[PDB]
Amino acid sequence: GNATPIPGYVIQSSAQVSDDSAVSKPGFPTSGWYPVSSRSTVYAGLLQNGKYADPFYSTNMQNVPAAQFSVPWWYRTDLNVDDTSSRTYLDFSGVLSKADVWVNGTKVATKDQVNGAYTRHDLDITAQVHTGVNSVAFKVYPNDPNRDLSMGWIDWAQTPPDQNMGIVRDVLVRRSGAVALRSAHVIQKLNSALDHADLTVKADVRNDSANAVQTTVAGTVAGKPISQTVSLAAKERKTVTFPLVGLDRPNVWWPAGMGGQHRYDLDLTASVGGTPSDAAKSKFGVRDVKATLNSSGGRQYSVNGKPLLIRGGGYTPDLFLRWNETAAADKLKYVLNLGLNTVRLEGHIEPDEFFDIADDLGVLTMPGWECCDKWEGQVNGEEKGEPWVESDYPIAKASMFSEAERLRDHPSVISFHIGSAFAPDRRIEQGYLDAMKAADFLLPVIPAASARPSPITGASGMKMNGPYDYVPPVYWYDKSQKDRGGAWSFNSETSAGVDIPTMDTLKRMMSASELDTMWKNPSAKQYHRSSSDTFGNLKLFGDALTKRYGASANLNDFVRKAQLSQYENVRAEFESHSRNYTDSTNPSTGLIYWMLNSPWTSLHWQLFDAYMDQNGAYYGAKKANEPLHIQYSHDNRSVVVINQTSNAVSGLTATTKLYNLDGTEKYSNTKTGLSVGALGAKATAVTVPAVSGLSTTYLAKNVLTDSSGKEVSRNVYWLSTKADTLNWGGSDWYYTPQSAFADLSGLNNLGQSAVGATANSVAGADGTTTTTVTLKNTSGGRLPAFYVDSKVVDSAGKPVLPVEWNANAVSLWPGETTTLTAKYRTADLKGSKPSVRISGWNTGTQTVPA
């Protein structure tokens, strides 16, 4: 019943190994080999040892010779075996791209068999294993994402020098008797009332001994005892199906905010001769999911019978696939701190623990294959990725079986994308559907994340029309352009491009001269944007920032304007889709922001940066996604209330006020007695009229109060009397140019205000600290304290990260007070007392003790 991951390896280039057979012989010398932990790419292993500077800074990654990664590298380990009575197996996946496998001088598997990142291998090495010191070695071949059914980085970042070659999941050493237990899972089916489920337990037993046996498979499913006895011929594998098990009042799994995140346990042992031979423990959730096309042709998800608007981001692992379990949890927790409900994984499908965490937190996941490389090479024409040859087909199908077997019992998974870009052809699709059936993977299959249909499954119900680069806030409210990215159908991957991180992050990833070029010449190429020619620079972003904000006087000026622009755009992107969700015709049914995060330190396509810091894009997404939310429509000036929560809400008041930048109120409307339905429904409070006398740049202050009088949402917009307008005829695949630009440059001369700050911290018994900050606009005039950003810092003024605030980037009118709460691990203070840095657009910067 043992399965123990190999904790580490020593690695070296095959340039240093003239005899392959020598490596896995006990006693082979490994002087100058690099010790690496489990789940290391070659380059990640070299970084672990010294060997190159931080690729997260400047052009360090460019200085790595890539030629050394065009030959195989060895991953070698010893294994102590005290007792060879039990059979021994190597059970693994995550090999990029393929490998020969050696035990004690014998090649047990070749790169023709061990091939493809997602394929699982269960190699019986019993005949090679002896008592005492054994040795195992993998010769890992170079990875080319265009040639290998593997992982590549598309245009998200820059290419890792080793192209991620290595072993990026665990290799398990399994020990068992005559019978191996494998692939234990639970088929679960809930009634529509959600008060009764039926559980079908299935498990494979394989008799690897020389003689026929009887084996009993027995244990517990969801607290209920189960047992089957089968006969097995020598070398026979069988799937055991247990009689149906009913479960009353099941603890149903819900997405975060809709109920609990319970998972039941499955615990089985296969016994031979009244003695345990092998054992397996797993979990599953009792949850129904569906994803169907609505009458308008949009893909509509529902969980447990409740339709949902998908509100998420494209998730990526680290650029060098460096795995850390706490980091994965910190990233999924930020999803909820954002108010988001979903992450999409375009390829790069994370180890099991990532899905365990998403299960435990109630974050929905959308895994699938990626575009623009080998996966779509048979159907994607002139795009990157090679045509398929006959040997490709069984690798892809085994990759599908393996991932379907891994993912089937994680309730967070709401679908699998079998295509991205292009839907698979009939042959490929059939092999994917066959593999999923064989795995009992019963979740929705989506053919493409674009509008392209597959021959069997059919219409995707999704769109990939862009944009991926600057478009003004009003763009997102478009429904008229059927080949563009407005708020209708399922937006599977879209953003307004550039997302300048915080200054603290900037100073860690770029030199002073790289930063100087960034603000002085946005048209210049930035290594920390993209290898793509199209996304190599920040020109569209820089042009609109100047036009709309005003020319940047310095680096500080550029970064501050970037944050407002990013907050403004990301907010409108999400808010437009929340609004249109309940449209009768062509509703929005999903939005995946491109992207949630970056593989590395980046200037684009992120909400949170590589260090987990939180900028304007972060705060703007968090504002748009709050559970009871008030918002302003950029297209028609409607003020709209959204209720994300699982219950209808009544007696809400929506209060909207316009102010000139001198603080003069120019309009007020108070709309009382609003009711809004659950799970994404809306109510319109008012349409703001054209108001005479507004400054060119003006403020809209929107406030939602419940029936108790509590303020539950505040949303402040900086607006212009001059419209952003689109030149739709100049549209390209990744953006639409503007025919005219809003004028928000009035903010440059917004007069100074004042805050107003007191902070205190409590170190909890759960290992976390909560810092509470009370901020007040203490000025003596009519000016708001606008866009006030509070940051937990140590004594050196460095941000404590990760961190989760209840609210931030707040605006307060004179005399107004807000109390804010930040939570973080006490240990991330690293012994420092906490302080709070408070910076506002028109309030300066101060830091206070906490």
**Which residues of this chain interact with ligand PNJ, rule CB under 6 A?**
154-156, 346, 371-372, 420-421, 464, 468, 493, 733
Burial 560-572 (b: 16+ CB within 10 A, else e): bbbbbbbbbbbbb
Q: How far is the CB of 487 from ligand PNJ (least distance, A)?
A: 18
- CA gyration radius, the chain: 28
380: three-class secondary structure by DSSP: coil
Six token digits for residue 352? 């099991």
Closer to ligand PNJ by CB, 37 or 534: give it. Answer: 534
Closer to ligand PNJ by CB, 86 or 420: give it. Answer: 420
Q: How far is the CB of 726 from ligand PNJ (least distance, A)?
A: 18
Q: How far is the CB of 590 from ligand PNJ (least distance, A)?
A: 15
Q: How far is the CB of 347 from ligand PNJ (least distance, A)?
A: 9
With tokens 């509100």, the residue in question is 311
Closer to ligand PNJ by CB, 240 or 464: give it. Answer: 464
Closer to ligand PNJ by CB, 74 or 468: give it. Answer: 468
Closer to ligand PNJ by CB, 156 or 581: give it. Answer: 156
In the complex, which residue's CB is closest to ligand PNJ? 733
Closer to ligand PNJ by CB, 368 or 840: give it. Answer: 368
Closer to ligand PNJ by CB, 372 or 755: give it. Answer: 372
Q: How far is the CB of 535 from ligand PNJ (least distance, A)?
A: 7
Q: How far is the CB of 308 from ligand PNJ (least distance, A)?
A: 23
User: Which spans in 306-391 are helix H?
Assistant: 325-337, 352-361
Closer to ligand PNJ by CB, 594 or 632: give it. Answer: 594
Q: How far is the CB of 466 from ligand PNJ (least distance, A)?
A: 6
Separation CA 581–CA 600 (nearest Å): 33
Closer to ligand PNJ by CB, 409 or 493: give it. Answer: 493
Closer to ligand PNJ by CB, 446 or 464: give it. Answer: 464
Cβ-based neighbours of 137, under 8 Å, separated by 6 or more: 23, 24, 74, 75, 76, 77, 101, 102
Answer whether the bond into residue 627 is a cis peptide, omega within 30°.
no
460: three-class secondary structure by DSSP: coil
Separation CA 841–CA 556 (nearest Å): 11
The secondary structure of 65-86 as a DSSP string is -SGGGSS-EEEEEEEEES-TTS
Closer to ligand PNJ by CB, 412 or 598: give it. Answer: 598
- Can you say whether the dihedral through the CA atoms of 648, 651, 652, 658 is positive or negative? positive
Closer to ligand PNJ by CB, 462 or 742: give it. Answer: 462
Tell me whether strands 785-793 and 171-176 are parallel, antiparallel or unpaired.
unpaired
Q: Dihedrals φ, ψ of 337, to 5°?
A: -65, -30
Instruction: Tell me which residue of 487, 478, 477, 489 sits closest to 449, measured CA to CA.
Output: 489
Closer to ligand PNJ by CB, 213 or 421: give it. Answer: 421
Six token digits for residue 311? 């509100």
- Can you say whether the dihedral through the CA atoms of 23, 24, 26, 32 is positive or negative? positive
Do residues 213 and 277 make contact, with C-beta atoms less than 8 angstroms apart? no
Instruction: Tell me which residue of 329, 322, 239, 292 sits closest to 804, measured CA to CA.
Output: 329
DSSP letter for 570, please.
H
Q: Dihedrals φ, ψ of 636, to 5°?
A: -120, 10
The half-sphere exposure of 679 on its side-chain side, counting CA atoms within 13 A, is 17
Q: How far is the CB of 608 from ligand PNJ (least distance, A)?
A: 18
Cβ-based neighbours of 297, under 8 Å, separated by 6 or more: 459, 461, 489
Q: Dihedrals φ, ψ of 841, to 5°?
A: -60, -50
Closer to ligand PNJ by CB, 150 or 779: give it. Answer: 150
- Can you say whether the dihedral through the CA atoms of 265, 270, 273, 275 is positive or negative? negative
Tell me whether strands 785-793 and 768-777 are parallel, antiparallel or unpaired.
unpaired
Q: How far is the CB of 596 from ligand PNJ (least distance, A)?
A: 13
Q: How far is the CB of 320 from ligand PNJ (least distance, A)?
A: 18
Q: How far is the CB of 374 from ligand PNJ (least distance, A)?
A: 14
Separation CA 170–CA 548 (nearest Å): 50
Closer to ligand PNJ by CB, 126 or 532: give it. Answer: 532
Q: How far is the CB of 492 from ligand PNJ (least distance, A)?
A: 8
Instruction: Tell me which residue of 513, 332, 479, 496 sits closest to 410, measured CA to CA.
Output: 332
Separation CA 269–CA 58 (nearest Å): 53
Six token digits for residue 145? 């994402």
793: three-class secondary structure by DSSP: strand
Q: How far is the CB of 534 from ligand PNJ (least distance, A)?
A: 7
Closer to ligand PNJ by CB, 45 or 314: give it. Answer: 314
- Cα distances (Å, whole numbers) of residue 357 to 318, 329, 412: 17, 6, 9
Q: How far is the CB of 426 from ligand PNJ (least distance, A)?
A: 21
Q: How far is the CB of 609 from ligand PNJ (least distance, A)?
A: 18
Separation CA 254–CA 363 (nearest Å): 9
Q: How far is the CB of 528 from ligand PNJ (least distance, A)?
A: 16
With tokens 């302080």, the residue in question is 835
Closer to ligand PNJ by CB, 475 or 741: give it. Answer: 475
Do residues 607 and 593 make contact, with C-beta atoms less than 8 angstroms apart? yes
Answer whether the bond into residue 802 is a cis peptide, omega within 30°.
yes
Q: How far is the CB of 445 from ligand PNJ (least distance, A)?
A: 18
